Each structure stands twice: as structure tokens, then as C-alpha cells.
């Protein structure tokens, strides 16, 4: 006996008991109430594959960029202050060589751009050293520190931020292609038609948003070789972050989902090297592949649940299930009680009377 007051540990133990993956039961649940067999692309993109979109990381990247913009503003403010303060230093040298009006004008200009450092300073010649001291503090202490922090944040945000997201998406696409190859391999041991079997092909799609994103990425790559103390790199990164923000803002469009959702970066086709039969074959092959330990072909978990077509239509589904070695439980209203009598050899009847229900299990 093993009790768990926690569903997480219970499910971990359950997935360890039957040597299956982390998504077999989710797939089993999806195909246990599916209403209608839709187009092949829709079925493969909605049922077989699991949702691993990257909409969450985009928000974090955007927030980090918005944090970086503040450091950039601080650096720009410091540079603006220094550029205004320098002419006062030039004017003092000129005076030590009338010109007091120009020096007063320069001190007024310097006080205009100050943000509190020169709080209460007049235009008296005794206040000239004070300005100079401030200038020195700008040149030797504040500006190097702000520049260093800005460069560190820029490099970290550009490398550990937007760069890894696209690599993750490409890796997900590669994993999808490899899994598709494996599914094609495991679907060969069956005959959809006498001496014929199905095959799955994936083709990359193209979109305007994808082209814009790739061009922006190329610009970001090309802008890293300039020596501008990081200005061009920041400008190049800003456009890419803006594109990601625009994509994430409206997450219910084909263009936006083509960027951050790997499943929408591919188009799937079926070869016969019928829609209901093909959909059932693909679903059954996916279920068989999911419920199989690596290096083995016999599932440890065998029972699956299905819903729902002439006699010949359903005659191949049963054969496929028996070939893959799966036990099935069907759900059907009081409409198709003619062909299930030939394949299913038992029945469970649910009687409702008021607000109560009862189950009776009987053979045919």
C-alpha cells in the first residue's frame, strides 16, 4: 500500500510504475472525448503535439529591456551634464589669462541642466571652483561607473535574453522533426491498404513576420562589430525587442503564433507510400508510440478510451488497435448498436431515473 497526500508525487510514482513519458497520459486524455476528426494539420497541431509556446519568456525579456532603458537614460543625462559643464572650465581659463558676462551665462546654462548637485550656487566668482569640482566628479567617478554598468547590462540582456529564446524555438522545431521521423518509423509495420502504408512529411512555412524577425536578427548580429560604446548594439536590440513585444501583445493571430509557437512553424502532409481512417491511424500510432518504453514494443499500460461511419469504416480501426496491441473502451449513444455487437463482447448500460444513475454490465 502507498498513500500520497499529494497528486504531484502520486503522478510521478504512477509514471515510474508504467515506464512511460511525462505526456502519455495527457495525450490519452486528449483523445478521450475528441468530438470530430478535423483536418490533418489541425489534428496533428492540436492533439498529437503538446503546447510548448514561449509566450512567457517574451514578457520577461521585454521587462528586462525596459529595465535597461533606465540605465541608458541615466548615462545620457550624465553625458549631457558634462557637456554643459565643460565650457565653464574653458571660461575660467580664459578669465585667468569684460568676460564675466560670458562666464555668468555659462554658469546659468550649467545650472539649467543640473538635477540637484548644484542646488544653491550663484554666479559669484567664488563659486567657480565649486562647478569645477562637480565637473571632476563627473569625469573620474560617475561616468565610468555608469558606462560600466550599462555595458554589463547590455551584454547580459543581449546574450542571456533574446538570443537564447530563438535557439530554444529552433531546438523545439528540431525535436518535433525527430519525433515525426520516429513516428514514421513505427507506423511502417502496418498496412493501411494491401501493400501500402502511410508516411508523414513536415515542411517549413514562411510568413511576413518571420522574414521581418530574421532580418532584425541579422541586423543585431551585424551591429555587434561596431565600436560605439554600445550605442549601435542597443539601437539594433531595441527593434527586435519591439517586434517581440508586438507579437506577444496579440497572441491570437496566425502571424504572432508563427513566431513564438513552434507547432505553427510547420505544415504536415500525409503520403500513401478516407479522412476518418487516416485520422484514426495517426491517432492510434501516436498513442502506441507514447505508451511504449524505449527499446520495447509491448505497452505496460494497454487500456485506452475512444469515441465513435459504416461497418467497413470501423472495421479497420479494430484491426489497427489489435495490431498495435491496445485494449479499447468505446463510448457510443443508442445509435450504433449494430456493429459494436460484432466487435465488442460486453456492454455497460447507464439508467437515469430522477437525479440518480445506475450501471448494469451485461454481455450480448
Amino acid at each position: 500500500i502507498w498513500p500520497y497526500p499529494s497528486k504531484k508525487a502520486f503522478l510521478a510514482r504512477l509514471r515510474d510504475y508504467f515506464e512511460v513519458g511525462e505526456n502519455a497520459f495527457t495525450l490519452l486524455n486528449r483523445a478521450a472525448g475528441l468530438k470530430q476528426l478535423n483536418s490533418i494539420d489541425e489534428i496533428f497541431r492540436e492533439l498529437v503535439l503538446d503546447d510548448r509556446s514561449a509566450f512567457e519568456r517574451a514578457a520577461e525579456v521585454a521587462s528586462s529591456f525596459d529595465d535597461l532603458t533606465d540605465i541608458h537614460r541615466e548615462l545620457e543625462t550624465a553625458r549631457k551634464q558634462q557637456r554643459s559643464l565643460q565650457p565653464v572650465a574653458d571660461g575660467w581659463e580664459r578669465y585667468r589669462a569684460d568676460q564675466k558676462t560670458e562666464l555668468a551665462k555659462r554658469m546659468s546654462d550649467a545650472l539649467k541642466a543640473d538635477t540637484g548637485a548644484l542646488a544653491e550656487v550663484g554666479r559669484e566668482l567664488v563659486d567657480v571652483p565649486r562647478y569645477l569640482e562637480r565637473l571632476r566628479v563627473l569625469t573620474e567617478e560617475a561616468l565610468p561607473e555608469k558606462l560600466k554598468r550599462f555595458l554589463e547590462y547590455l551584454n547580459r540582456s543581449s546574450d542571456d535574453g533574446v538570443t537564447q529564446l530563438l535557439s530554444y524555438i529552433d531546438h523545439e522545431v528540431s525535436m518535433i522533426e525527430e519525433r515525426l521521423d520516429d513516428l514514421n518509423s513505427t507506423m511502417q509495420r502496418v498496412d493501411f491498404q494491401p501493400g501500402r502504408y502511410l508516411r508523414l512529411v513536415a515542411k517549413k512555412v514562411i510568413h511576413e513576420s518571420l522574414r521581418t524577425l530574421q532580418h532584425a536578427q541579422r541586423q543585431l548580429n551585424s551591429a555587434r562589430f561596431i565600436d560605439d560604446e554600445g550605442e549601435s548594439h542597443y539601437k539594433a536590440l531595441q527593434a527586435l525587442v519591439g517586434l517581440l513585444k508586438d507579437a506577444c501583445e496579440h497572441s491570437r493571430n496566425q502571424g504572432a503564433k508563427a513566431l513564438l509557437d513552434p507547432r505553427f512553424r510547420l505544415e504536415f502532409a500525409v503520403s500513401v507510400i478516407e479522412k476518418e481512417i487516416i485520422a484514426s491511424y495517426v491517432l492510434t500510432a501516436s498513442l502506441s508510440y507514447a505508451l511504449c518504453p524505449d527499446g520495447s514494443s509491448r505497452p505496460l499500460f494497454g487500456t485506452i478510451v475512444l469515441d465513435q461511419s459504416s461497418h467497413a469504416v470501423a472495421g479497420r480501426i479494430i484491426a489497427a488497435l489489435r495490431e498495435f496491441g491496445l485494449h479499447a473502451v468505446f463510448i457510443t449513444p443508442n445509435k450504433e448498436m449494430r456493429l459494436l455487437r460484432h466487435h465488442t463482447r460486453s456492454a455497460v448500460v447507464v439508467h437515469r431515473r430522477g437525479v440518480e444513475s445506475s450501471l448494469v454490465s451485461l454481455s450480448w
Partner: protein, 349 residues
């Protein structure tokens, strides 16, 4: 508490010392570099990387050297490699793992107390307390003299002598810690000045800077180093310090306190300090001379303009099709410069 983790991650990603320590070939790189600073770098690195296959060569040696140059672990000035502060910090951390001198001792406590007393009495401007402290110290010294005249000369025991020798070595060896830090501080000031001159290029700034004789490249570390090296020059106390060190090193307890390298380091302390301090002012002078030469050349505006044009060309180059051989071999427009004659006048004879 949360910000500390972010700071640690940033330091891990950026700082050269942690990157060097976390590198794959860290022990060999550290050993080779420490041996060097005691092209040829490429040859020595390849030699050391050769007989350590375990776990090309020349290609990877060059790649590693250029990777460390990019990370600013070392610097390349004209054709030579120079060490930085991160390398010495990493070396100190690595070689402190074997033997570290204890600082939780009684001698360190006495030094701290005396230093605190000296500092506290140094900041007091009152002319009344100072006389009181002077009288107290004079009276205490007189009492000790009276006690000694009775025949009570005190001598440190063997353990106390060893502790004192080790503490003196530990304190004295720390005077060389920040020699590379000053040079690293000057280099970045030079780089920032050149960038500001280029980005401005206004000729008035260059003319004003050239006209003045006041030295450029001023940094907070430079002033501290100047104050240190000014007092280093007062030989009237350096001679006394050297003589006292020579007297100390001739004691029976020395072999049990310090080994041979430590005795050598304490033996030639003053000479090495003066020699290494005189080698930093020359670096500063060279930096200033190079900056003045660059300013006098007067090609900053051309650099700015060519940079802008190259940026425009590189932006434009992303919109053509490089996958077609027809476009890659399409003739461009660039005039013939440095036209050599047509080989010969076509008369061999």
C-alpha cells in the same frame, strides 16, 4: 537578498577572473601565464598544451589566446602581452588554497588596537587633549624604562616570535597588491578620452588640450599611488627599515616560521618595492606621450566619417542576394590606386 544573486550571476557572466577559473583548461593556462610573467606566448602555450592531451593544438592555442585577449584578462599593446589585475587576483586565490597565514591572532589584535588609537588621536584638533595623550604616553614609557633599569628585560617566547614573524611577513607582502590596478585605471581613461575626442571631431577641444601643460589621465587610484610613492622616496626611513629587517632575519626561530622563498621576499623588500614603483611612472609617461601624439596627428574626423560610411555600406549590404554567383562577381566601382606598371614594356631581350 534577491539582488545579491543577480550580482553573483552578472559577475559569473562578465568578470574575467571567474571566467578563467571556470574554464576547461584553467590549471594549464594559470601555470603557463604565471611562469611567463616571472608569439612566444603562443609557443609556450602550445608546448604546455601538447603533453596534457588526456582529459590541432596550435589553432586552439591561438583561439584561447584571442579569447582571453577579448575578455581583457590580458592586454595587447603593440606586439606584446601585458598582465591585468584579474589575472593576479585569480593567481592569489589559487595559491592561497595551500597555505594561508592566520589573522585571528593576538599580534593582529595588538596592531589593530594601536592603529585605532593612532587614527583616533590623529583626527582630534583640540590642543588640550593632545597634550594629555602625549603626557600619558611619556609617563608610560618612563615607567617601562624604570622597570627595565631594575633588570626586567622582556623577550618574546618562541611561539610569540614565530607569530610575530609570520604576521610581519603577511603585512609587508601586501604592499604590492595594487600595482597593476593603477595601470588598468589609466588605460581605460586613455580609451575614454580617445572615444570622446573622436565622437566630438571638434578642433577647438584638441587645440585647448594640446596647449595646456596640465597632465591628462587623472584617476582616483593615481592620486593614492602618487601619495604612496612620494613617501616611498624618503630613504632616511627606508635604510632603517632595511637594517631592522636584516637584524630580524638573523634569528634562530626564523627557519620554523618562514621557508626559503618567504625569507628571500623579506630580504629584498625595499629594493624590489622601489624598483617596481619606478616602473609605473614610466608607463604613465608613455601613455600620456601616446595620447598627445594621437591628438597631434589630427585624423579623428576622418575616422568618424569613414566609420559612418562603413556603417551605411554594411546596412545596405544586407539587402542583396549573396547566394547567386552572378551578383557576387558583378563589378563594383572603386578606382585604381597604387597602379603598378604593366609588368614590363613587353621587350624582354
Amino acid at each position: 537578498a534577491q539582488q545579491r544573486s543577480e550580482r553573483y550571476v552578472s559577475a559569473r557572466s562578465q568578470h574575467p577572473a571567474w571566467l578563467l577559473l571556470a574554464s576547461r583548461r584553467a590549471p594549464l593556462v594559470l601555470g603557463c601565464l604565471r611562469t611567463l610573467f616571472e608569439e612566444d606566448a603562443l609557443q609556450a602555450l602550445s608546448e604546455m598544451l601538447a603533453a596534457y592531451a588526456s582529459q590541432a593544438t596550435h589553432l586552439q592555442a591561438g583561439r584561447e589566446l584571442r579569447e582571453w585577449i577579448k575578455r581583457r584578462l590580458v592586454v595587447e599593446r603593440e606586439g606584446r602581452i601585458y598582465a591585468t589585475d584579474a589575472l593576479e587576483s585569480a593567481i592569489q586565490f589559487v595559491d592561497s588554497l595551500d597555505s594561508r597565514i592566520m589573522t585571528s591572532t593576538a599580534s593582529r589584535l595588538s596592531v589593530v588596537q594601536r592603529e585605532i588609537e593612532n587614527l583616533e588621536t590623529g583626527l582630534n584638533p583640540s590642543p588640550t587633549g593632545r597634550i594629555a595623550s602625549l603626557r600619558r604616553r611619556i609617563q608610560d614609557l618612563e615607567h617601562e624604562l624604570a622597570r627595565v633599569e631594575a633588570g626586567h628585560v622582556d623577550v618574546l617566547d618562541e611561539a610569540q616570535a614565530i607569530e610575530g614573524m609570520r604576521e610581519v611577513y603577511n603585512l609587508a607582502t601586501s604592499l604590492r597588491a595594487d600595482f597593476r590596478r593603477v595601470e588598468d585605471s589609466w588605460r581605460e581613461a586613455d580609451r575614454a578620452l580617445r572615444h570622446s575626442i573622436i565622437s566630438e571631431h571638434r578642433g577647438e577641444i584638441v587645440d585647448r588640450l594640446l596647449d595646456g601643460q596640465d597632465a591628462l589621465l587623472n584617476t582616483p587610484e593615481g592620486r593614492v599611488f602618487e601619495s604612496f610613492q612620494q613617501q616611498l622616496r624618503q630613504s632616511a626611513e627606508l635604510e632603517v627599515m632595511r637594517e631592522r629587517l636584516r637584524t630580524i632575519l638573523r634569528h634562530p626561530a626564523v627557519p620554523k616560521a618562514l621557508n626559503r622563498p618567504q625569507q628571500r621576499e623579506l630580504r629584498w623588500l625595499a629594493l624590489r618595492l622601489v624598483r617596481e614603483s619606478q616602473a609605473v611612472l614610466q608607463a604613465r609617461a608613455r601613455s600620456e606621450r601616446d595620447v598627445r601624439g594621437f591628438m597631434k596627428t589630427g585624423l579623428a574626423a576622418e575616422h568618424h566619417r569613414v566609420g559612418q560610411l562603413l556603417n551605411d555600406f554594411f546596412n545596405l549590404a544586407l539587402s542583396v542576394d549573396w547566394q547567386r554567383q552572378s551578383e557576387r562577381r558583378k563589378p563594383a566601382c572603386l578606382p585604381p590606386v597604387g597602379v603598378a606598371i604593366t609588368g614590363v614594356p613587353a621587350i624582354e631581350r
